[PDB]
Write a protein that binds this ligand. Structure first.
Ligand SMILES: NS(=O)(=O)c1cc2c(cc1Cl)N[C@H]([C@H]1C[C@H]3C=C[C@@H]1C3)NS2(=O)=O
Ligand SMILES: NS(=O)(=O)c1cc2c(cc1Cl)N[C@H]([C@H]1C[C@H]3C=C[C@@H]1C3)NS2(=O)=O
Ligand SMILES: NS(=O)(=O)c1cc2c(cc1Cl)N[C@H]([C@H]1C[C@H]3C=C[C@@H]1C3)NS2(=O)=O
Ligand SMILES: NS(=O)(=O)c1cc2c(cc1Cl)N[C@H]([C@H]1C[C@H]3C=C[C@@H]1C3)NS2(=O)=O
Ligand SMILES: N[C@@H](CCC(=O)O)C(=O)O
Ligand SMILES: N[C@@H](CCC(=O)O)C(=O)O
Ligand SMILES: N[C@@H](CCC(=O)O)C(=O)O
Ligand SMILES: N[C@@H](CCC(=O)O)C(=O)O
Lengths: 260, 270, 270, 260
């Protein structure tokens, strides 16, 4: 039985190679998550077919409709059998799907244009001159929405009541906006994506401050699925063997198309 | 029905109170683990009694006897209900118990006695003799060791990486034995060896010892791997899901980092 | 029975919301005073509705009529039950209303236009034509004035000190009048006078305005006196004791300090 | 009817006269509080005699016996008609006696012997090397005991479980201990007393950091007494007339037996 794998077009996790027009099957995709899915399939022993989610949504709940979208919705409603993708392990997602152990640690950080005047998040929140947003239908926005800390609550009040719209449909759109806003815009995104962007050409974006929190990416399965324990054990074995560290080093720092 | 909470005696996770002789119950202990357990019980309401394992061992399945020992050993045999302790998630451990999501990150690091500042315009510079695991595994003047019956020993035993393979090859055959039973024993060995012994311990305990007096140690190099501590639970238990949800709630509520800052960086003597 | 709370329209005690055209009730205002009202209503259970006085004046007595106006005026004649507003405690108001213990300290200070950077090794220094109330009293190039129907005006009127007597003597018969109808109008006059006019206002408002953009002002010298802000209440009312105990509770708990820090130093710039 | 006035031997509030052995009546006492009592009695129009409380204690609740001591207990039990003294206005005291409007501003400050490694109270609480204590049966002790902030809770747990005893019987004993402990001790006391001590010979003590909180001194009076409103009005009149400022300048800065 072929296992349908859902995933998102995110770099360096999934990319459509360079000549994908002449390739078919799983051979037209590449990245960290493709290699991770290959290793998971090798360990468990099943045939898999990578599928990109129809809408570039990670997963959230809509406006009082109680319907899941994105990869989480693709998993809950029986469309996909597993989700190997940069899916953050969160409170609301775990109650509806099973998350394996985190295969990559991360945190929420700030990226700006290339001694920064803001650095820490308190200084950026206090200074209302420079705008900042997040990725819609993601986990950073839901982290700010449900946070009870004063600084994060103030930041959420700022971003919610912002004119014009400060949210970005895609993280690539957020990166382009940061590059094109001449330093008047800041981006709140995951640390791994921030490092990958800042270490890539044209290398004009830099990451300031520390990490607001600490989270992780997990391999998700539908609630009550038979693949949960096998993929959890596969992730543990891969972490012990160092395959995850090798994959991160290959896909994050091996090329390094900038001077640093 | 009141369930028991087994734990190891390790700082700053669990520490004895200064006047703990006359207190009784959960009040005799203090640290990150005790109020972690308090907040876990607050999230899902239940009565807990703190206990310390008799052998004082983290847990590692033996050889040729096929018997689990330590916290894991007494957890699989139904003498403990939940282990809110710095137990490291490990593949062989996961096959016999259940772990929650990691509540604090960690890594294997190197602790050596802090060298004295070099005299040589008048800027003082700190130079250590070991700066990475590869040069530690290449030399022989400095000996290194791990904690007996722990996750680090098992990690070094089964590692196929060349540097770690050489590390374990030297560790297994070395007189006197380079292994210690208590983390405090290893720290004392580092502090008394006069910069000729290196301790391979967890990064969290390493940094905690760095932050406290007499601060005669330094952490060299980066973490050798990435792992995490998980709250243990035996298979076929109804407490696994509530515990996991409680850990997720505490992580998303900004409580785990607050406790980490309170117990690690606030009381920084050095 | 729901009592009414009347407040003055000044920042940062009570400020209009940005998109305030759509919300109704107590959600149309924000600031230190609305938080104080919320905590007062939390310490003792009662429903409150915020109101703004029609005249917009703090309160005093009118000449040759002996009729109170302002917040005190609408408090004495039964049109209000409590005034959680920056109302200065004076002797002429204590004989007609009740005042709780002060919840914030204040003092009459001097606000002038901030001078420029003195170019003359290469170090910038701040020099102002006015450094204290005495030299402001002798000099006549710079005019000065106080808010009309306030507490500072009544303090300067009823003063026997020679410097303050001279201050009042100049203020009374100036051409044109040096008094202003609103603190915002006085600050606008200071900003538009090109440094030839100085405003005598409370230290709290002066500091808050100095901390906020465009921050073209600064406070010179020290406070001319020590005074406090009280929560007013009509004479013979069954709310003075609970309000006073609530203020004491908030001061002991540190709520007043955190509210001051949040509304004065967590929103400033330059 | 002669009004009995209770007070405490505190400098510069009440001092015993340099030639007091040859004087009788109220003429054998001097200080800020003596002049304040004289002005209060002049405004109100009554004959008063100054009485020093039989124990040099301000007032507190003892161990579960529910009995007030010091000046507060000298007022509640119908032995003193008014208390003009450096009595802090507090939550517990107000429920039992009436406090007039404050006539002095103050706060809890730290006094040490003359790089200043201590700085604010955070670094003093985080460093257990140097001991710190307060005055027993006062307001600082009851401020730390009932505090709910982490720093103040930690400080109170430190002082309570400290061997040997760290609380001083009298504030003068605290100053002597600070001067003699070779700077291994830190005194927590009101800012007014701290300034007066640091501005007097031998001028070997100094005050660091700011004030943790803001409080005030108030003229107390038995609950349900006719003197409350007249003394409140008198304090307000003296504050508007600038007599309290003049008295503070006379008794705090007029002499200044130190070079600063
Ligand atoms: N260095 S890294 O970010 O690629 C990374 C991060 C992590 C890894 C493995 C790697 Cl390689 N494994 C851990 C998992 C493994 C076992 C121990 C903790 C969890 C369960 N999660 S992690 O701490 O998020
Ligand atoms: N900063 S820290 O080491 O105290 C720390 C470390 C971690 C935290 C929370 C904190 Cl505060 N939560 C994560 C958990 C949250 C969700 C995502 C990964 C696991 C499930 N594990 S973690 O990456 O091991
Ligand atoms: N630091 S501040 O100006 O916000 C401030 C000022 C004051 C506070 C509390 C604070 Cl936080 N409480 C005091 C009150 C408490 C008790 C002692 C004096 C009055 C009754 N009044 S105060 O001296 O006017
Ligand atoms: N400068 S000082 O400390 O001697 C000082 C301090 C204060 C004074 C008067 C003086 Cl002189 N009066 C005020 C009182 C007067 C009226 C206004 C606030 C209270 C009621 N309390 S105070 O703000 O605590
Ligand atoms: N990786 C995040 C989305 C990215 C973001 O929100 O910044 C998730 O899976 O929820
Ligand atoms: N935390 C480790 C023990 C510490 C060590 O082995 O260094 C474990 O749970 O196994
Ligand atoms: N706070 C003053 C008004 C401000 C002023 O007069 O400057 C009062 O309540 O009367
Ligand atoms: N002045 C304080 C006592 C001094 C102290 O506690 O430091 C009071 O009257 O309560």
């Amino acid at each position: 039985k072929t296992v349908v794998v859902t995933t998102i077009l995110e770099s360096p996790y999934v990319m459509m190679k360079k000549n994908h027009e002449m390739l078919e099957g799983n051979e037209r995709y590449e990245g960290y998550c493709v290699d991770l899915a290959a290793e998971i399939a090798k360990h468990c022993g099943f045939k898999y077919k990578l599928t990109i989610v129809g809408d570039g949504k990670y997963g959230a709940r809509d406006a009082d409709t109680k319907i899941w979208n994105g990869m989480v919705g693709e998993l809950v409603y029986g469309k996909a059998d597993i989700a190997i993708a940069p899916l953050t392990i969160t409170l609301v997602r775990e109650e509806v799907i099973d998350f394996s152990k985190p295969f990559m640690s991360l945190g929420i950080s700030i990226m700006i244009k290339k001694v920064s005047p803001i650095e820490s998040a308190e200084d950026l929140s206090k200074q209302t001159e420079i705008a900042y947003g997040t990725l819609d239908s993601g986990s950073t926005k839901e982290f700010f929405r449900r946070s009870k800390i004063a600084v994060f609550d103030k930041m959420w009040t700022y971003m919610r009541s912002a004119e014009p719209s400060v949210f970005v449909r895609t993280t690539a759109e957020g990166v382009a906006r940061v590059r094109k806003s001449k330093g008047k815009y800041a981006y709140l995104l995951e640390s791994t994506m921030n490092e990958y962007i800042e270490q890539r050409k044209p290398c004009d974006t830099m990451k300031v401050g520390g990490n607001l929190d600490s989270k992780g990416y997990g391999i998700a399965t539908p609630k009550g699925s038979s693949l949960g324990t096998p993929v959890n054990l596969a992730v543990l074995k891969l972490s012990e063997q160092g395959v995850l560290d090798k994959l991160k080093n290959k896909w994050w720092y091996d090329k390094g198309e900038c001077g640093a």
